[PDB]
């Protein structure tokens, strides 16, 4: 029974308001100069990382934008909406240059390969589609989940595609055949978010049942993190191993990646004019500097937390 390490806690230092719809997704520019929020106001808003000023706002999705990602090696924006469409945007002309169409239902998430540069889009028709970027053709259609696929992870390691759906199963896919190889039924509830550690060849899955850490490539079941047992809509992990789990009740639970020890339990506030039901976290994301945490709250706010740098190990003790 190892003694867990001490990750320092976090403190809220800025709150951004201005959306008239729910902040569905937060993406950060990979050079860490600005970030961007895709809202339920069908608005893709580029915000400054430092000043927090609204750089730009774009429309075009006829329904709610579910996913926003900016390519790390190409100057392109890939925004999937709930209008059964994905828009590729050239930011040099700031226009929709390419259209990805063919999902029979509303698209809930997307991911890109970091080196192959191929698109995967999980939607409400219990399927994902794998599209070539330039020719906009769905060269594959991953299927096998019975419920709508909540999230997809596209990694360069094996297996490449990790799909978490609402049928309490996780599918881990061989990419070259487009076929699922591992299926995990171990979650009792809907798998809504998964997070990969960037170096330890491992991942974790958040559900209303529990959190489950596994290991690539066979999906070997490493750990079961109990606690924060609400509808975990979003997950992120630091390079330090600081695991942030954010659920639809607006609570942040912060953990060590290795031991699974919950070191922080922080519930944020809401907007002044807002309901108590409007506290639900849609996207938690670290910056590229791994120093600022951006949470996408259901009162149409973006709450960015700083590290609680004044904390010490005896002011914040590690339990057991």
């Amino acid at each position: 029974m190892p003694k867990p390490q001490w990750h320092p806690p976090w403190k809220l230092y800025r709150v951004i308001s201005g959306h008239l719809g729910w902040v569905r997704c937060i993406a950060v520019e990979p050079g860490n100069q600005w970030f961007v929020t895709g809202s339920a106001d069908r608005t893709i808003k580029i915000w400054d990382l430092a000043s927090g000023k609204l750089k730009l706002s774009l429309t075009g999705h006829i329904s709610t934008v579910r996913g926003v990602i900016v390519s790390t090696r190409s100057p392109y924006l890939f925004s999937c909406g709930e209008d059964k469409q994905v828009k590729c945007w050239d930011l040099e002309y700031n226009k929709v240059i390419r259209h990805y169409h063919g999902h029979l239902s509303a698209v809930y998430g997307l991911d890109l390969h970091p080196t192959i540069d191929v698109l995967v889009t999980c939607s409400r028709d219990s399927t994902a589609r794998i599209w070539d970027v330039r020719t906009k053709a769905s060269v594959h259609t991953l299927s096998g989940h019975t419920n709508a696929v909540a999230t997809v992870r596209c990694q360069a390691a094996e297996p490449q595609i990790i799909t978490g759906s609402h049928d309490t199963t996780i599918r881990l896919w061989d990419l070259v055949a487009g076929k699922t190889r591992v299926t995990l039924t171990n979650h009792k509830k809907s798998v809504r978010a998964v997070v990969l550690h960037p170096r330890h060849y491992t991942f974790a899955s958040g559900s209303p049942d529990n959190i489950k850490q596994w290991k690539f490539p066979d999906g070997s079941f490493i750990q079961n993190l109990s606690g924060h047992n609400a509808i975990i809509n979003t997950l992120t992990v630091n390079s330090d191993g600081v695991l942030v789990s954010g659920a639809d009740n607006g609570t942040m639970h912060l953990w060590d990646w290795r031991t699974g020890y919950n070191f922080q339990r922080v519930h944020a506030a809401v907007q002044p004019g807002s309901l108590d039901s409007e506290s639900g976290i849609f996207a938690c994301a670290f910056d590229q500097s791994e120093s600022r945490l951006l949470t996408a709250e259901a009162d149409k706010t973006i709450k960015v937390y700083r590290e609680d740098d004044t904390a010490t190990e005896e002011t914040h003790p590690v339990s057991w």
Binding site: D48, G273, S274, S289, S291, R292, D299, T301
Partner: protein, 100 residues
């Protein structure tokens, strides 16, 4: 579907090239060697620095109420972001502008 012979005009070959990020466009070759941390504190420091006989009365004496425009100041009350469109200030301005 490997067998279809119907071609939409949005299915034509177009935009077939892929532009990539140059070193002016934050290339991944310089993303790795660049550390975003002290960039973030220098840009936050820059933002924090650049944040900063017969005599009559007074002719206006024949009124009942004096100085009624005393506490009238809008300031940041309109800038208070109420996230409730029943009580949104833009919504109230919309109602008085569009309703006579």
């Amino acid at each position: 579907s490997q067998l279809s012979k119907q071609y939409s005009s949005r299915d034509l070959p177009s935009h077939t090239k892929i532009k990539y990020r140059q070193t002016t466009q934050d290339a991944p070759e310089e993303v790795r060697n660049r550390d975003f941390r002290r960039e973030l504190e220098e840009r936050e420091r820059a933002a924090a620095r650049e944040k900063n006989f017969k005599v009559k009365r007074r002719w206006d004496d024949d009124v009942v109420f004096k100085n009624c425009a005393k506490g009238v100041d809008d300031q940041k009350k309109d800038k208070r972001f109420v996230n409730d469109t029943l009580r949104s200030e833009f919504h109230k301005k919309f109602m008085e502008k569009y309703i006579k």
